[PDB]
């Protein structure tokens, strides 16, 4: 496959993905199994003005990754941008 054809296929695929977001249910429970299991991410950084997608990932890890995060023995740093900006910017207090 050419980079030109792969590019237009990406453009087409993202068009109907975006177009059918409001026209399909948000399957986020198993999206939480794409970055917490399939990629094994250690920082769940939320971008937004309140912790909406932070209390879902912590409670997803408490519910069905307490024994997966004990088997691999990895620490998931669950933050937001509005609440815990002191940690993402790496700007502690003296």
């Amino acid at each position: 496959m050419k980079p030109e054809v792969e590019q237009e296929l990406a453009h087409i695929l993202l068009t109907e993905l975006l177009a059918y977001q409001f026209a399909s249910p948000v399957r986020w429970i198993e999206t939480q199994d794409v970055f917490l299991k399939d990629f094994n991410t250690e920082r769940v950084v939320e971008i937004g003005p309140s912790p909406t997608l932070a209390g879902m990932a912590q409670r997803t890890l408490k519910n069905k990754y307490e024994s997966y995060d004990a088997a691999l023995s990895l620490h998931r740093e669950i933050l937001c941008y509005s609440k815990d900006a002191k940690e993402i910017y790496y700007t502690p207090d003296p």
Partner: protein, 847 residues
């Protein structure tokens, strides 16, 4: 054991041989260094004159039998690449090294069902015999005793795995530049490691023969300069580019305008002296960035100069072009830890494991022969004794995070001394962390400076959709950040040039009434943009395209937007504030370089547009803000509203862990599907937020007061659906469920149409929304949004590399790939003609 260390004797009548036995060898056989001296009896004051002639090659031969297993040879040119014999990594080669240096890394231990990783300072062990072989040739003449290893860096290349056990890693090397300093001679040599053919890491090696060297004929500087990117936005710098003789083009009339030129520049530099360059020759390819994002050769840098005092090409590009990667500092350096390490009693445990048997580490007689205060600990050991504490904290005891590591050797250390390394975090480099270390002994004296370029852990970005609407969101960031300023301004400029209002005004003071005046020549383009937006709804089962703003035509002077409290409550002004302040937040973190190059990102409902515009930049912020506005208006008029503006749809935030303990997420979807089939009113689980604890159902206002009352009965009766369908009877719970739904749906038809939706024991009605989005209700309204999306998102700006494996939709919720099976999956979930156009012609696209 009491071994002979010195044999002093006459060799001939007038010649003394003082011989120094060194015992610790590859083959157990001790090696003699016969230092010759002349005893002149006629010169009574200083009769002992050292034989300086024939001295460097005798020191070389001695060192050869400690470092080089090959035959003793010095008639190989330094310029020519030097090969290393293929060196493999075992589990013993990790246990002896890590115990010797105290590298207490569990990734370097044997744990079941995972490969053993190796220390990044084992790479010197891998490639010592190739790296040091560089300095040996007779044109690189010097005294190896006085030779000070200055610096020793590693750069684990982007995309390759760090070293593991088994991995048979070939070594090569070449001498970057040999330069006669006034104080001596600094040979810079790079000794890369190659596994499975491909290079793994480059291992920089700066050596210093201290002395006075006139051999400038043997000096050269074959520096492979970093690539330099520069955007060609003007026709002023073009004229500058065309005036540059070095800059030659394969196409002389090639459009350089609005392109991106990268320059893989390498400069060879020969010398008359340490200052003036006999020959300067900058060459390399010039790579224009094609819209597909690939880099194609369009020309050649070909500089040719005699008596030059600098590289014009680098001088030109470093000012007028970027390095491809710009670091940023911290506001304050982080005082990580002031830790203490101890050099070991003996330097034998490291000398043996590495195969660096330089006697100045072991032989007290060789040590004092070179004026050193005793048997000097290996510099590389101290390097591994501080990099283990750099691998201990910054990389959270992980080995794959380490990319770079440079360690200048400043002070000479005796065995049994108490070091004090103050670890200092300084800035970011494109996500990765810059850590500056500074080792001081017992007496506060600098010993080891340098740094480590450590990857941050794998990161995931979760962009919030809608939710809490607030006046003055991200105004503090807007006042402070330079990126936040740029993005908001851009948004605002696009808004006032496209839709005739200021996004800043709305978020700042939240006006109740905003009047868009189509007043002038500019006003007409705004009116055409407002009468250009279409949506599609079903009345009497017909696919008709209705007009957004039914009270706007071409006689319409001014439109008014209204709100009860404030316009930040209306979705079409709320959502552009949220997606802008998110994008601002991300462009502040990117400006601070806190974004990993391979970090995944999954957006929620609205966040996916912020995420894509953020991580991919496939649409401009000018495109994003008008895309969320068009959707926010499409998400407004999609439902039929009464004269007051209220509709018969709405949300709930289902908590199935509050109705029953054994109430699974197969039971809530079964109850909602059965209610939709019984009552005949639309209700759908539209948000799979948290497993059995947080959902959202979208449908009719009546249809969300029957499932609530079905879950109010089931809690107060204590009857499960998943037990009785299995262990009692087959398809009896289907009939027994429709009578509970018939009871719940009879009381939910009596009340009028603008019904007050109740908060159940396991249901919370999400106020401020009355549109069923993420449901089947908007199947009709999808088609016009395609015609909208095509104009906005351009195919040239879509980068497949940046999206691949990182962009996780909320449709499929998989790693984005350009494969037939992914398009099949998207067709299965959403029936579309252009997906099956590809699937059928899949093999035609293949070739």
């Amino acid at each position: 054991e009491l071994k002979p260390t010195v044999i002093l004797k006459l060799l001939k009548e007038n010649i003394i041989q003082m011989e120094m036995i060194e015992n610790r060898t590859m083959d157990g056989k001790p090696v003699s260094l016969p230092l010759l001296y002349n005893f002149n009896p006629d010169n009574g004051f200083a009769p002992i004159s050292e034989v300086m002639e024939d001295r460097n090659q005798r020191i070389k031969e001695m060192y050869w039998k400690l470092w080089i297993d090959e035959p003793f040879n010095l008639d190989f040119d330094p310029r020519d690449v030097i090969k290393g014999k293929d060196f493999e990594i075992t589990a013993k080669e990790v246990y002896d090294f890590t115990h010797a240096v105290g590298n207490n890394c569990e990734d370097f231990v044997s744990r079941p069902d995972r490969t053993m990783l190796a220390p990044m300072d084992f790479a010197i062990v891998v490639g010592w015999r190739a790296i040091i072989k560089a300095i040996f040739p007779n044109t690189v003449d010097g005294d190896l005793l006085k030779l000070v290893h200055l610096s020793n860096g590693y750069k684990m290349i982007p995309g390759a795995k760090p070293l593991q056990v088994g991995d048979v890693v070939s070594t090569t090397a070449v001498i970057e530049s040999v330069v006669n300093q006034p104080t001596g001679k600094i040979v810079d040599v790079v000794g890369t490691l190659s596994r499975n053919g491909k290079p793994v890491m480059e291992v920089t090696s700066s050596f210093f023969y201290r002395g006075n060297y006139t051999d400038f004929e043997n000096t050269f500087q074959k520096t492979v300069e970093p690539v330099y990117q520069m955007h060609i936005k003007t026709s002023k710098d073009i004229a500058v580019l065309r005036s540059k003789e070095w800059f030659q083009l394969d196409d002389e009339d090639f459009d350089l305008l609005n392109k991106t030129l990268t320059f893989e520049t390498e400069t060879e530099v020969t010398f008359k002296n340490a200052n003036i360059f006999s020959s300067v020759k900058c060459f390399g390819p010039i790579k224009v960035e094609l819209p597909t994002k690939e880099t194609v050769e369009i020309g050649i840098v070909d500089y040719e100069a005699g008596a030059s005092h600098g590289n014009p090409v680098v001088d030109f590009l470093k000012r007028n072009g970027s390095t491809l990667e710009q670091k940023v500092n911290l506001e304050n350096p982080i005082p990580i830890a002031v830790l203490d390490s101890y050099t070991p009693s003996t330097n034998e445990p490291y000398a043996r494991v590495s195969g660096d048997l330089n006697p100045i580490h072991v032989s007290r007689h060789f040590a004092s022969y070179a004026n050193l205060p005793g048997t000097i600990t290996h510099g590389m050991f101290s390097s591994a004794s501080v990099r283990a504490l750099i691998e201990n904290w910054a990389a959270d005891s992980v080995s794959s995070r380490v990319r770079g590591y440079t360690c200048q050797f400043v002070d000479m250390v005796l065995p049994n001394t108490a070091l004090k390394t103050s670890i200092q975090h300084v800035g970011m480099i494109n996500g990765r962390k810059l850590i500056k270390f500074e080792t001081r002994n017992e007496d506060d004296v600098v010993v080891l400076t340098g740094e480590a370029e450590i990857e941050q852990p794998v990161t995931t970005f979760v962009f919030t959709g809608q939710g809490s609407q607030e006046q003055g969101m991200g105004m503090d960031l807007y006042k402070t950040s330079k990126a936040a300023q740029d993005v908001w301004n851009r948004a605002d400029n696009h808004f006032k040039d496209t839709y005739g209002f200021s996004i800043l005004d709305i978020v700042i003071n939240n006006p109740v009434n905003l009047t868009i005046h189509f007043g002038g020549e500019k006003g007409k383009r705004i009116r055409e943009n407002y009468s250009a937006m279409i949506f599609e709804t079903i009345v009497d089962g017909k696919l008709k395209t209705e007009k957004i703003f039914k009270e706007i035509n071409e006689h319409s002077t001014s439109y008014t937007f209204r709100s009860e409290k404030g316009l930040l409550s209306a979705t079409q002004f709320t959502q552009p504030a949220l997606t802008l302040m998110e994008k601002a937040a991300f462009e502040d973190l990117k400006s601070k370089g806190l974004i990993p190059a391979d970090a995944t990102f999954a957006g929620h409902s609205l966040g996916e547009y912020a995420a894509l515009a953020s991580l991919a930049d496939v649409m401009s912020i000018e495109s994003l803000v008008e895309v969320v506005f068009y959707r926010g208006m499409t998400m407004q008029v999609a439902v039929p509203r009464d004269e007051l503006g209220r509709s018969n749809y709405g949300m709930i935030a289902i908590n199935p862990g509050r109705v029953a303990a054994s109430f699974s997420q197969e039971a809530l979807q079964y109850v909602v599907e059965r209610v939709g089939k019984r009552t005949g009113w639309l209700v759908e689980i539209v948000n799979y937020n948290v497993e059995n604890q947080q959902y959202v159902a979208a449908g009719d206002l009546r249809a969300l007061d029957t499932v609530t009352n079905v879950l109010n009965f089931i809690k107060l009766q204590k009857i499960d659906i998943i037990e009785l369908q299995k262990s009692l009877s087959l398809e009896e719970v289907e009939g027994h469920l429709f009578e509970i739904i018939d009871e719940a749906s009879k009381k939910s038809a009596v009340k009028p149409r603008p019904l007050k939706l109740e908060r159940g024991f396991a249901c919370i009605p999400l106020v401020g929304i009355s549109v069923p989005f993420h449901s089947t209700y908007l199947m009709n309204g999808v088609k016009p949004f395609k015609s909208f999306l095509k104009k906005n998102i351009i195919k040239e700006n879509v980068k497949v590399a940046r999206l691949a494996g990182k962009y996780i939709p909320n449709l499929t919720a998989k790693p984005f790939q350009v494969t037939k099976e992914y398009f099949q999956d998207v067709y299965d979930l959403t029936g579309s003609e252009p997906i099956k156009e590809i699937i059928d012609n899949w093999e035609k696209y293949e070739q």
